[PDB]
Enzyme design. Structure first.
Site, PDB file in Angstrom:
ATOM      1  N   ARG A  30       0.821  -1.220   0.000  1.00  0.00           N
ATOM      2  CA  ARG A  30       0.000   0.000   0.000  1.00  0.00           C
ATOM      3  C   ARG A  30       0.853   1.269   0.000  1.00  0.00           C
ATOM      4  O   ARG A  30       0.394   2.344  -0.429  1.00  0.00           O
ATOM      5  CB  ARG A  30      -0.946  -0.001   1.193  1.00  0.00           C
ATOM      6  CG  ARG A  30      -0.234  -0.056   2.518  1.00  0.00           C
ATOM      7  CD  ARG A  30      -1.218  -0.207   3.658  1.00  0.00           C
ATOM      8  NE  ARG A  30      -2.109   0.931   3.681  1.00  0.00           N
ATOM      9  CZ  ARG A  30      -1.802   2.111   4.215  1.00  0.00           C
ATOM     10  NH1 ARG A  30      -0.627   2.298   4.809  1.00  0.00           N
ATOM     11  NH2 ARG A  30      -2.688   3.097   4.165  1.00  0.00           N
ATOM     12  N   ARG A 150     -18.731 -26.766  12.668  1.00  0.00           N
ATOM     13  CA  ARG A 150     -17.822 -26.312  11.599  1.00  0.00           C
ATOM     14  C   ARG A 150     -17.738 -24.782  11.536  1.00  0.00           C
ATOM     15  O   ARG A 150     -17.093 -24.237  10.624  1.00  0.00           O
ATOM     16  CB  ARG A 150     -18.303 -26.872  10.253  1.00  0.00           C
ATOM     17  CG  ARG A 150     -18.381 -28.411  10.235  1.00  0.00           C
ATOM     18  CD  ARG A 150     -19.313 -28.864   9.149  1.00  0.00           C
ATOM     19  NE  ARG A 150     -19.200 -30.304   8.885  1.00  0.00           N
ATOM     20  CZ  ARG A 150     -19.746 -30.916   7.850  1.00  0.00           C
ATOM     21  NH1 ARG A 150     -20.520 -30.239   6.995  1.00  0.00           N
ATOM     22  NH2 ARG A 150     -19.536 -32.224   7.677  1.00  0.00           N
ATOM     23  N   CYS A 170     -11.943  -8.570   7.163  1.00  0.00           N
ATOM     24  CA  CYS A 170     -10.983  -8.894   8.196  1.00  0.00           C
ATOM     25  C   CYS A 170      -9.598  -9.051   7.579  1.00  0.00           C
ATOM     26  O   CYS A 170      -9.448  -9.116   6.340  1.00  0.00           O
ATOM     27  CB  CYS A 170     -11.386 -10.174   8.928  1.00  0.00           C
ATOM     28  SG  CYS A 170     -11.191 -11.670   7.973  1.00  0.00           S
ATOM     29  N   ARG A 190      -5.118 -12.640   4.922  1.00  0.00           N
ATOM     30  CA  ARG A 190      -5.243 -12.177   3.526  1.00  0.00           C
ATOM     31  C   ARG A 190      -3.866 -11.828   2.959  1.00  0.00           C
ATOM     32  O   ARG A 190      -3.700 -11.744   1.735  1.00  0.00           O
ATOM     33  CB  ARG A 190      -6.170 -10.958   3.428  1.00  0.00           C
ATOM     34  CG  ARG A 190      -5.616  -9.777   4.226  1.00  0.00           C
ATOM     35  CD  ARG A 190      -6.645  -8.659   4.222  1.00  0.00           C
ATOM     36  NE  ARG A 190      -6.087  -7.425   4.769  1.00  0.00           N
ATOM     37  CZ  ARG A 190      -6.782  -6.471   5.381  1.00  0.00           C
ATOM     38  NH1 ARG A 190      -8.099  -6.610   5.619  1.00  0.00           N
ATOM     39  NH2 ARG A 190      -6.142  -5.367   5.770  1.00  0.00           N
ATOM     40  N   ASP A 193       3.599 -11.255   5.779  1.00  0.00           N
ATOM     41  CA  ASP A 193       4.961 -10.808   5.608  1.00  0.00           C
ATOM     42  C   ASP A 193       5.810 -11.972   6.058  1.00  0.00           C
ATOM     43  O   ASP A 193       5.931 -12.243   7.266  1.00  0.00           O
ATOM     44  CB  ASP A 193       5.102  -9.598   6.519  1.00  0.00           C
ATOM     45  CG  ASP A 193       6.515  -9.120   6.641  1.00  0.00           C
ATOM     46  OD1 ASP A 193       7.481  -9.832   6.249  1.00  0.00           O
ATOM     47  OD2 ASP A 193       6.658  -7.950   7.104  1.00  0.00           O
ATOM     48  N   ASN A 201       3.364 -14.894  13.984  1.00  0.00           N
ATOM     49  CA  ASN A 201       1.967 -15.373  13.908  1.00  0.00           C
ATOM     50  C   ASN A 201       1.791 -16.871  14.133  1.00  0.00           C
ATOM     51  O   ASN A 201       0.779 -17.288  14.741  1.00  0.00           O
ATOM     52  CB  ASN A 201       1.302 -14.845  12.616  1.00  0.00           C
ATOM     53  CG  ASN A 201       1.112 -13.322  12.674  1.00  0.00           C
ATOM     54  OD1 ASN A 201       1.001 -12.778  13.762  1.00  0.00           O
ATOM     55  ND2 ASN A 201       1.133 -12.643  11.546  1.00  0.00           N
ATOM     56  N   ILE A 232       7.682 -11.451   0.465  1.00  0.00           N
ATOM     57  CA  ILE A 232       8.947 -11.136   1.084  1.00  0.00           C
ATOM     58  C   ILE A 232       9.289  -9.699   0.667  1.00  0.00           C
ATOM     59  O   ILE A 232       9.324  -9.352  -0.525  1.00  0.00           O
ATOM     60  CB  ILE A 232      10.085 -12.099   0.633  1.00  0.00           C
ATOM     61  CG1 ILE A 232       9.867 -13.516   1.205  1.00  0.00           C
ATOM     62  CG2 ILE A 232      11.473 -11.572   1.102  1.00  0.00           C
ATOM     63  CD1 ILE A 232      10.720 -14.592   0.616  1.00  0.00           C
ATOM     64  N   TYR A 233       9.499  -8.858   1.656  1.00  0.00           N
ATOM     65  CA  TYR A 233       9.996  -7.497   1.388  1.00  0.00           C
ATOM     66  C   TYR A 233      11.384  -7.523   0.747  1.00  0.00           C
ATOM     67  O   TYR A 233      12.205  -8.368   1.105  1.00  0.00           O
ATOM     68  CB  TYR A 233       9.933  -6.638   2.654  1.00  0.00           C
ATOM     69  CG  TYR A 233       8.513  -6.140   2.849  1.00  0.00           C
ATOM     70  CD1 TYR A 233       8.044  -5.044   2.098  1.00  0.00           C
ATOM     71  CD2 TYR A 233       7.621  -6.797   3.718  1.00  0.00           C
ATOM     72  CE1 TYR A 233       6.733  -4.610   2.215  1.00  0.00           C
ATOM     73  CE2 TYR A 233       6.320  -6.363   3.833  1.00  0.00           C
ATOM     74  CZ  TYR A 233       5.888  -5.263   3.088  1.00  0.00           C
ATOM     75  OH  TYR A 233       4.582  -4.840   3.209  1.00  0.00           O
TER      76      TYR A 233
END
Lengths: 284, 284
Positions: A30, A150, A170, A190, A193, A201, A232-233
């Site tokens: 972004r 579920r 989200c 979504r 990184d 995470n 990957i940055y």
């Protein structure tokens, strides 16, 4: 209306890095900052008698645990987390008033969505008890009332998105699953990184799964991590190429040191990582 | 507040079936009907110069196309789809009045969430223009305004869940992704009936991706299908074991026969499947 927002299991992570390095395409984020990107990835980490704290660099476990406990508290006070920093970018800061953001009041953001989704906000440190949907307690309640369900799902939003549009999507969806007295968790993000966010995470949601399983009397099963835009940055390529040269060591164990009955009752002192032998820290 | 709700690509589907048959565990669905279940799966289907209509049984393409067009219309009139039947189970029928469900009025359900999310319902065939969030138009608009966006997401709900609780979770989340003039799509479903639902859903979302790519001037890329509870109904085990013995044939092509400018303008006659050579139909 992050976080958020047999072969060794870590070989999946390293293979995903190698795949993005080889086959990822240039895509801007972004801010117009370049990444190498592949869309659609998945990896499965066993939580059975081991804990997937990556070993090819030292992962900041202390911050994983402290940030998760802050989220579970539903806190919107940045100073209640003053032993590190949350979520680039902070463009959502532009939506806040002068006095309120100087105090560390973040508005209805982060854990506020886990514990009080849709409640009318007032200020941090006001009593939100019984207001909004408590997604986290709902997950725990559903595990206890209908483990075949579920729909055992909780979502997290990037705070930047909340004032952007009606029904904003989200950032992460976490689904739980119970069979044979084992609790598994699938995290869909979504975007991920891969250098910085992803290892953090994995630890965060594996920790959450350990906590929920503890209080529901179940054994941890699998953690499944699923990505949209896995990236990957560019400035992380060289450190990642070096980390790929490292051989994973056996995963550590996570011990919970006390019987805990309610999710809100966990403290950082209740947790102990055992047998963690990582390669050295990589700054990204 | 379904649908819904180099090796040949179909080898992924067959491998997933084989894995569930071998390693899936017994788990009951909401009706107490037995399944074999694994949690967390993913498969990637190229949409480049081919279309992933499964070849190891004849997939009901006519119904895939007709149901998708009905959903795109935002229709809540069951009779506007009278060339087949939608979504077990229909427990959500118990939430409806006498007169209204006799007419084929389903209440705010299915495509109503794609085109008019959150609008106050009245009756089918009333004018909902400009009411609620149009998730589908929003996706198309986002592709056109910011193709790098990581939030190009639309959700579908099982109608049974809508009157069950506040903030009910979706059944499926569809994320789009654009790079190098190609549109990809990832479908996450919280559960997938591997025998009956899954092949239908691959075709449905691949078709959607073709349609969106057509109107945005992009080429179709990949379709990624991701599942929570991936399951095989017990009564489908024997037919599936037989289907596993069949060798996939090259995927067909999908042609769009006209230049179409708006998503609402597609008709069933605009589409042509070419070179489809499936094995025979399997009744499940």
């Amino acid at each position: 209306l992050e976080l958020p927002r047999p072969p060794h299991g870590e070989l999946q992570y390293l293979g995903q890095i190698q795949h993005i390095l080889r086959c990822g395409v240039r895509k801007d984020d972004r801010t117009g900052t370049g990444t190498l990107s592949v869309f659609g990835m998945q990896a499965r980490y066993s939580l059975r008698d081991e804990f997937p704290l990556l070993t090819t660099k030292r992962v900041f476990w202390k911050g994983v645990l402290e940030e998760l406990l802050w989220f579970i508290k539903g806190s919107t006070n940045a100073k209640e987390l003053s032993s590190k920093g949350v979520k680039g970018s902070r463009d959502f800061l532009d939506s806040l008033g002068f006095s309120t953001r100087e105090e560390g009041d973040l508005g209805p953001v982060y854990g506020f969505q886990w514990r009080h989704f849709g409640a009318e906000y007032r200020d941090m440190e006001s009593d939100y008890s019984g207001q909004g949907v408590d997604q986290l307690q709902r997950v725990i309640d559903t595990i206890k009332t209908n483990p075949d369900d579920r729909r055992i799902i909780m979502c997290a939003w990037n705070p930047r998105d909340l004032p952007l549009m009606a029904l904003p999507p989200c950032h992460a969806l976490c689904q739980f699953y119970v069979v044979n007295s084992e609790l598994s968790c699938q995290l869909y993000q979504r975007s991920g990184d891969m250098g910085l966010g992803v290892p953090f995470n994995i630890a965060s949601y594996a920790l959450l799964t350990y906590m929920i399983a503890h209080i529901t009397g179940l054994k941890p099963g699998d953690f499944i991590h699923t990505l949209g835009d896995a990236h990957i940055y560019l400035n992380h390529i060289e450190p990642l190429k070096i980390q790929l040269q490292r051989e994973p060591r056996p995963f550590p164990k996570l011990r919970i040191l006390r019987k805990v009955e309610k999710i809100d009752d966990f403290k950082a002192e209740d947790f102990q990582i055992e047998g963690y032998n990582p390669h050295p820290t990589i700054k990204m």
